[PDB]
Structure 1
Amino acid sequence: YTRVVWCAVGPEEQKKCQQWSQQSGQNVTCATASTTDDCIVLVLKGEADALNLDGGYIYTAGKCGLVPVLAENRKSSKHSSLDCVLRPTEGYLAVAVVKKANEGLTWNSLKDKKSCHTAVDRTAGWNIPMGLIVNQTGSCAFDEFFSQSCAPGADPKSRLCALCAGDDQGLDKCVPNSKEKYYGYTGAFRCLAEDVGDVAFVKNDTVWENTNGESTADWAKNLKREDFRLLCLDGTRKPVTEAQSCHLAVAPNHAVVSRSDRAAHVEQVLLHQQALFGKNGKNCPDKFCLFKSETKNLLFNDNTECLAKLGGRPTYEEYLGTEYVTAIANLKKCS
């Protein structure tokens, strides 16, 4: 074995990565970059070995020869005697969320409203919704569909960044890392909870984990699920309890990627690392938990039960599924 160098995106992932590094006895060390794309560049250069990516990034990195190693696997919906590591991943539900009190709003009245996206180029917050929107409007002007948005990663002086808030000091407005207040699943849902935006494009799981006391964070601790509605593609609205019949698409689970070169070694170390810091892991909660960071989803989504092995040694296209792959392809024609 040698060490595995993980790539942390932003200072909060860096700090968490260093805690992990320390606990692993340098078996895992850290490289840090300002963006996911930058981390994908470090891995390509061979300065970093791997990182966990959202589907939209798995596509980007895949075009560059990086490969899926293990996928995030969460609380299995069905009953499974199968170990978490061996269980097939189910994929998460991408949804569009609005305030119940925002009464006139349906999927069909989204034009000129304010939007909250996890980040440009991501599955639930971006590829799915804009793909859908571009298709339905028959126009590639997705930068002008919404009057204003927070879409971390877009031009900071553009409308797509208008609603973004930057860090503590108001710096880094719209950067695609956790320093941006409205970045990622939780940040985009916060953007909605605080009424900065009219709709948030996140995943089903995010609504639940930040409402009804599930989150103690100050902005979320008082949020209640009844106050939110999901927007279905048929123009109707439903309670956040009906994501199964009111989502925009099913999305491929985030997955760890690495140089094909190091795929095997990276997989080795992570299986061992989660046996140590995963859910029910030997040293979690006692010394360190790889899948916790207080609803901030650093390095891995906090709801991750384990990293699962991938059946069929899949290519990035097979991992993502041909439907999602063409979906992304078409949307990129637009740029």
Structure 2
Amino acid sequence: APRKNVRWCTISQPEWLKCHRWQWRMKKLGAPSITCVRRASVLECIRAITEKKADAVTLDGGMVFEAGRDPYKLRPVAAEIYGTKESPQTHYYAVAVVKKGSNFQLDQLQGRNSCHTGLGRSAGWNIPMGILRPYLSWTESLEPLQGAVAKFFSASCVPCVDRQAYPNLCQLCKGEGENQCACSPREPYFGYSGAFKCLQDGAGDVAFVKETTVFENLPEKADRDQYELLCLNNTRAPVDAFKECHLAQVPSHAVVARSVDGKEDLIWKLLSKAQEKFGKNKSGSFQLFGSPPGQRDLLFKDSALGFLRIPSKVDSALYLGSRYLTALKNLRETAEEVQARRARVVWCAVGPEEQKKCQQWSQQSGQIVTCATASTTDDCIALVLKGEADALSLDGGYIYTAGKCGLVPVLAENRKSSKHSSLDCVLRPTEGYLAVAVVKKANEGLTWNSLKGKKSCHTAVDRTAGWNIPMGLIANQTGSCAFDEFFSQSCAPGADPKSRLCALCAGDDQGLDKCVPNSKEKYYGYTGAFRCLAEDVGDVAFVKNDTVWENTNGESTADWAKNLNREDFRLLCLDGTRKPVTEAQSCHLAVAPNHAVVSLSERAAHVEQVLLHQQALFGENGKNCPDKFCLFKSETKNLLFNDNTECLAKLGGRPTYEEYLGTEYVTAIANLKKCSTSPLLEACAFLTR
């Protein structure tokens, strides 16, 4: 079928020859047929793929980044595994190898001859330029990195550069005629082994490659001895010392496919079969990870142990990692364009309504705070990881997911409290909020023991009050992991839209975006889920004490709420009792930990300082609060923060997400998550690999 086979993109004749040799041994094994597409440059394949002319190609990390940028939107589906069968690695090292006997060090490359694997490649270009930036004397306001580099080295061979604009950089290249500097193996000194040969042939003084390049080209140690590495501290060392003498560690190459309609599973079915039949140390007629004499790294890096399947949620940015992603980014942006990015705090807004409140806050703040937006909290978390956003306030259940991804609590949302009216809000200890089950008095006979079969309203899936606590307790008493099988129907924003957990959700004013986990969905959040109950859409709602009081007896003023009486409602206790909504202290399901602001540990220090100041202006008793703008007031819609919040308190020290949530709650969620797999959670385990 037009999708029952994978078309592989090749950028050279031998690669094409290898591909056909691969396609041949494949059918004999009966697997998704392999079609081979011919091309002449890496770009051509990237473009070819996104244009549905091909489905797969293995790319270097720096090309993987470039492939994920909007025009193409490609994504890593499988990572090459290196190292050894007992000690595998999914990363490698960028080293600078030089002929033993020379004298120059890292800080003396000026005027030398250079050998690069290719332009935009991890080891051959990205890492070095990063390290060598201080000595380059480059001004983006005058010319591009290439210009600076062309004025640094006297001559080199950086395949792919423009021999017309920057001849200086294609001199040492050995390509024949038009092939000179070609961005493909059509150029001898192209790739890892090419740049190495560029050095071996004494054309250049340095070769920027990876740790294994030497051991792959020179087997007899006697030969190796003639070569050394350049260490960061400006000293040389033997090539087997790369673990100590390296410029940087980078992520392995990856196979990339289309983001949408990419044949992922098909590509992976083939690779997993291919590696199991013709992998390392495996059958020796045809080697998947080997190229004929004089040929190298055809299709896949030579001597790779195999592949690793990449989870659906990790895209190019995530796959590369914060460290590498930052480095690459610093290469494409201005020096101040980056300083600006660091001086400001980028808030992540979830939905159109929160986005609007944020754009407002941004204006009032003076542009110190800026905004980024996502349709879901999970997406905002990913944005913070990629460095697109700095922070946001998360419910306890989300702090577990953000925690499982390395984000940390910074300040906690402090609701005005009766107790401890002794201290000031910013240093006042946090007192959780009570999660409760509310029902309508009229709903006779409905107690905790009779929730089975009823209809339910939940703030959203994965949140404390509306999900973790209720479903946690229901799972323990039910034994089963089937929650969508407990209630006949419900509204739990975030669940499968085609599921019955979304069968009672509204969507926006036009019935659109039904079940979407953001304020656009009528029955989302504390207030949304309460309204779901009030309107008789569900038999029970799972919210917190505060919600009942804030939207009854005319405290909301919103149509559905203005005429609601708190005496019309009751709370379901765990002892099978119903109680007036004034009996919360004795009739709650659990006391949850306050919502809090998270961020990357390396950014936390900054975010906090900016926040404590912001809140001094638009917080409860801020300079311009009533009059110009109030941070914790969103007209009962709880946008960005809860409306009943007085301030954001210091967490006293630097608790981890586990410390903040409490052991009790953490395991509770943990055991419940054992019933379901969360894409972001999977993607995150992989982030630590």
TM-score (norm 1): 0.98
Secondary structure, aligned partner of 1:244: coil
Secondary structure, aligned partner of 1:319: helix
Secondary structure, aligned partner of 1:13: helix
Q: Deviations over 1:189-247 (max 9, x none)?
A: 00000000000000001000000011100000000000000000000000010110011
Distance in 1 (CA, whole Å) between partners of 2:506 and 2:444 is: 26
Q: Deviations over 1:129-164 (max 9, x none)?
A: 000000001111111000000000001111100000
Please, which runs of 5 or more residues in structure 1 have no aligned partner?
A: none
Question: Which residue pairs with 1:304 in the alignment?
Answer: 645
Q: Indicate conservation of the 8 Å contact 2:420/2:428, yes or no.
A: no
Higher mean C-alpha displacement, 169-178 vs 70-79: 70-79
- Figure out how many residues of one structure are paired with residues of the other and give that number: 332
Secondary structure, aligned partner of 1:289: coil
Please, which runs of 5 or more residues in structure 2 have no aligned partner?
A: 1-342, 675-689
Secondary structure, aligned partner of 1:160: coil
What is the deviation of 1:285? 1.0
Distance in 2 (CA, whole Å) between partners of 1:228 and 1:80 is: 30
Distance in 2 (CA, whole Å) between partners of 1:124 and 1:79 is: 24
Higher relative contact order (CA 8 A, sep 6+): 1
Distance in 2 (CA, whole Å) between partners of 1:108 and 1:261 is: 48
Q: Indicate conservation of the 8 Å contact 2:425/2:649, yes or no.
A: yes
**Cα RMSD for the two superposed structures:** 0.6
Distance in 1 (CA, whole Å) between partners of 2:548 and 2:602 is: 38
Distance in 2 (CA, whole Å) between partners of 1:266 and 1:305 is: 18
Distance in 2 (CA, whole Å) between partners of 1:18 and 1:63 is: 29
Question: Which residue pairs with 1:64 in the alignment?
Answer: 405
What is the deviation of 1:261? 1.1
Q: Indicate conservation of the 8 Å contact 2:351/2:373, yes or no.
A: yes
What is the deviation of 1:79? 4.4
Distance in 2 (CA, whole Å) between partners of 1:110 and 1:102 is: 12
Q: Deviations over 1:82-127 (max 9, x none)?
A: 1100000000000000001101100000000000000000000000
Q: Deviations over 1:4-37 (max 9, x none)?
A: 0000000000000000000000000000100000
Structure 2 residue aligned with 1:120, among 454, 461, 477? 461
Distance in 2 (CA, whole Å) between partners of 1:79 and 1:153 is: 37
Secondary structure, aligned partner of 1:206: helix
Question: Which residue pairs with 2:487 in the alignment?
Answer: 146
Higher mean C-alpha displacement, 7-16 vs 307-316: 307-316
Within a 5 Å distance, the mapping from 1:1-335 to structure 2 comes to: 2-333=343-674
Distance in 2 (CA, whole Å) between partners of 1:298 and 1:142 is: 28
Q: Indicate conservation of the 8 Å contact 2:361/2:631, yes or no.
A: yes
Q: Indicate conservation of the 8 Å contact 2:397/2:468, yes or no.
A: yes
Distance in 2 (CA, whole Å) between partners of 1:142 and 1:148 is: 10
Distance in 1 (CA, whole Å) between partners of 2:643 and 2:473 is: 28
Distance in 2 (CA, whole Å) between partners of 1:25 and 1:132 is: 46
Distance in 1 (CA, whole Å) between partners of 2:419 and 2:666 is: 27
What is the deviation of 1:81? 2.4
Q: Deviations over 1:268-292 (max 9, x none)?
A: 0000000000001001011100001
What is the deviation of 1:77? 2.1
Q: Indicate conservation of the 8 Å contact 2:572/2:579, yes or no.
A: yes
| Pair member with larger Rg | 2
Secondary structure, aligned partner of 1:85: coil
Distance in 2 (CA, whole Å) between partners of 1:17 and 1:312 is: 28
TM-score (norm 2): 0.48
What is the deviation of 1:313? 1.8
Secondary structure, aligned partner of 1:226: coil
Distance in 1 (CA, whole Å) between partners of 2:506 and 2:375 is: 17
